[PDB]
């Protein structure tokens, strides 16, 4: 029974630092350059994590890369939200041990409204008493929550994979529950929570896209993979060619 959960717990990424100089004065360029670097570093971990997920290899190679490239933002925000909840009870955004955002940095980063939503998401982990197991399963499901409207190379293997991950999330809920009405209510809350991640990720997508375009003008550096994915994949999302899969309407 614990087979699926054993795996998710086993492959969960450890701590990742951003390499931020917390002894230097906060500035838009410094903060954003550190966040971009952190994205580059976490992307490497997301790639190795995803590749180890049950059944991930069933997907066509090109789709494997695709889902990672479309979902990285939501995945990273979700996990960051969890770190914040567990490390500082959502009081600040715990991006990395060396990059913790307080209200001041939220303002200097010029993405205060987005940070607020992320902190709100972080608060939900508490307001809903999300278990470490529900967290893991929901995070896995977020990798299979955004695809092009024209479908993937092999849409069939993906649908099968997404369906099984929904089944696993349903299994976890029905675990310490014998009441079918309680399970339905918990599933409703979790799916609602999962959906709330997409609007936040889209705001970050728009923001990083605009920032990439004018990076040379604000002294903000974008690592190589980030620059590539944000100029090639993110636009497909912003233009509506690639869309999130919502549980509710």
């Amino acid at each position: 029974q614990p087979i699926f959960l054993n795996v998710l717990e086993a492959i969960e990424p450890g701590v990742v630092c951003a390499g931020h100089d917390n002894n230097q004065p906060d500035s838009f360029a410094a903060l954003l350059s550190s966040l971009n670097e952190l994205g580059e570093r976490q992307l490497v971990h997301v790639v190795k994590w995803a590749k180890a997920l049950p059944g991930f290899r069933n997907l066509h190679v090109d789709d494997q890369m695709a889902v990672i490239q479309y979902s990285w933002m939501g995945l990273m925000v979700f996990a960051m939200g969890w770190r914040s909840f567990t490390n500082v009870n959502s009081r600040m955004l715990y991006f990395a041990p060396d990059l913790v955002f307080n209200e001041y940095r939220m303002h200097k980063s010029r993405m205060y409204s987005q940070c607020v939503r992320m902190r709100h998401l972080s608060q939900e982990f508490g307001w809903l008493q999300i278990t470490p197991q529900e967290f893991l399963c929901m995070k896995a499901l977020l990798l299979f929550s955004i695809i092009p409207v024209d479908g993937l190379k092999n849409q069939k293997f993906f649908d099968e994979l997404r369906m099984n991950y929904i089944k696993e999330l349903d299994r976890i809920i029905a675990c310490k529950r014998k009441n079918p009405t309680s399970c339905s209510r918990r599933f409703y809350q979790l799916t609602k929570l999962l959906d709330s991640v997409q609007p936040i990720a889209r705001e970050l997508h728009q923001f990083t896209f605009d920032l990439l375009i004018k990076s040379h003008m604000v002294s903000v550096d974008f690592p190589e993979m980030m620059a590539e994915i944000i100029s090639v994949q993110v636009p497909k999302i912003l233009s509506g060619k690639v869309k999130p899969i919502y549980f509710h309407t």
């Binding site: 992307l43 490497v44 790639v47 890369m65 490239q69 690592p223 190589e224 993979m225 590539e228 994915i229």
Partner: peptide
């Protein structure tokens, strides 16, 4: 590309 590089690794 860097991504392709990392994917190969």
């Amino acid at each position: 590309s860097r991504w392709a590089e990392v994917w190969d690794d």
